[PDB]
């Protein structure tokens, strides 16, 4: 299919249902369709910078918008979780993070914060010619990783060079962000990882309020240590 009804659009975009007959269909890109925010929605229905699709197209063709330090001219480019969006004309940098409600929230950041991002290590494997590499959640393949980096770890990627500045191991007491399930958007600390081989591993997460909740491992994203997140939170 190539057409998306507004009522069928994802909930997390915050789009109003009755605005039109159709909603933008996120084109293929780093993030999944149900886990992405197309640039048109971000520019029009969230920032209110543009009043219609044609204005968004004009803005993009002017090359005023950068995603992760690269200029994008596709209206439906699927920006997603932890994607750095730079508007140089206004001098703003934004980082996409879910809210407790489960919707993307436009969080402004500093230039240094914009310079880097974090990626969850989805895979670690050796490529051709015996060159180790890591695949993150945003589809980035980074070569020559640090040996200590393992799956479920989080790597701090410098956008300009695309190289791993630092890394965080997955361990109890680490600060985690939920990216799935009913607990989507919640922040807490790992307490214990319940392990079911051949099944979805489970992580217990305790919030600052001492409330505890259980979530599948795939939906967990290490973002730092307790009291020391590596990114500015809203």
């Amino acid at each position: 299919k190539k057409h998306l009804k507004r009522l069928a659009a994802p909930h997390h975009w915050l789009l109003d249902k009755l605005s039109g007959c159709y909603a933008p269909r996120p084109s293929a890109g780093p993030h999944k369709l149900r886990e992405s925010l197309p640039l048109i929605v971000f520019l029009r229905n969230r920032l209110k910078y543009a009043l219609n699709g044609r204005e968004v197209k004009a803005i993009l063709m002017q090359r005023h918008v950068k995603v992760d330090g690269k200029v994008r001219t596709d209206t439906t480019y699927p920006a997603g979780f932890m994607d750095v969006i730079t508007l140089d004309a206004t001098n703003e940098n934004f980082r996409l993070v879910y809210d407790v409600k489960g919707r993307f929230a436009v969080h402004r950041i500093t230039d240094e914060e914009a310079s880097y991002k974090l990626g969850k290590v989805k895979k670690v494997q050796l490529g051709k010619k015996g060159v180790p590499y890591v695949v993150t959640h945003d589809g980035r393949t980074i070569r020559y990783p640090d040996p200590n980096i393992k799956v479920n770890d989080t790597v701090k990627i410098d956008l300009a060079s695309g190289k791993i500045t630092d890394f965080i191991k997955f361990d109890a007491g680490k600060l985690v962000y939920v990216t799935g399930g009913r607990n989507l958007g919640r922040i807490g600390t790992i307490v214990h990882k319940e392990r079911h081989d051949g099944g979805f591993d489970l992580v217990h997460i305790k919030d600052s309020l001492d409330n505890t909740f259980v979530t599948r491992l795939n939906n967990v994203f290490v973002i730092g240590e307790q009291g020391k997140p590596y990114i500015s939170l809203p």
Partner: peptide, 16 residues
């Protein structure tokens, strides 16, 4: 078994 799937209706308000 457990779904662990987000549900929009639960978070969406039903006050009306």
């Amino acid at each position: 078994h457990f779904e662990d799937r987000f549900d929009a209706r639960e978070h969406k308000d039903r006050s009306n």
